[PDB]
């Protein structure tokens, strides 16, 4: 349920 964008999870 978490996605990663540019190294950060959100």
């Amino acid at each position, epitope marked *: 349920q978490l996605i990663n964008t540019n190294g950060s*999870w959100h």
Partner: antibody
Amino acid sequence: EVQLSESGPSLVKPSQTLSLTCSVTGDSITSGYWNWIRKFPGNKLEYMGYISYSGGNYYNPSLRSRISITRDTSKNHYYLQLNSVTTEDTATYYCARLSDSLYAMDCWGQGTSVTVSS
Amino acid sequence: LVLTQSPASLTVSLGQRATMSCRSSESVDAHGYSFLHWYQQKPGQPPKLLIYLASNLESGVPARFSGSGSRTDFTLTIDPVEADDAATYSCLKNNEDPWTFGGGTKLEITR
């Protein structure tokens, strides 16, 4: 069982481009995160980057200038490219999947040795 | 100082307890998860995931491996140590940029 096979040249001249291919066989690359990791002779592990399920990219800051990770969903392959290589790029390169559930890299390839020399 | 592993090298006898620590220098916690994982690396083999998210045991990994760290302090425990456990172990931090690996802990068996 997810299976990752890596292919590509094992000798690259300096300043030229290193190209490697990772073939995945278990889950689609339209799901999860697909990374490249390399192993220096000192046994140190350096993370390079990934391509995401939607095609997004995240790269290590020290490699962001000369790295590229692309994919081919029809072939279910994703690729690694490293430009302007030097002798410091001689390492064992791995391709691995980062699971959405685990949030860590759980399935790896056996790795391929690449040497940078003239 | 981003990721510091301790000890650098370790020498433990069979059937005993080996303890290693990974220092984060800043929290790797986000959304109630600790994004720190333990990997085992053997010669001529890719890194193998042992513990994911600080304290969960990966499938196929023996119950001898356990993790329990939080915020900035993490620990990997091998008990009892077996002859097959002789390898280098690394912690991985992937909460935010940059994703880094620890220097590693070289564990040697005593006989």
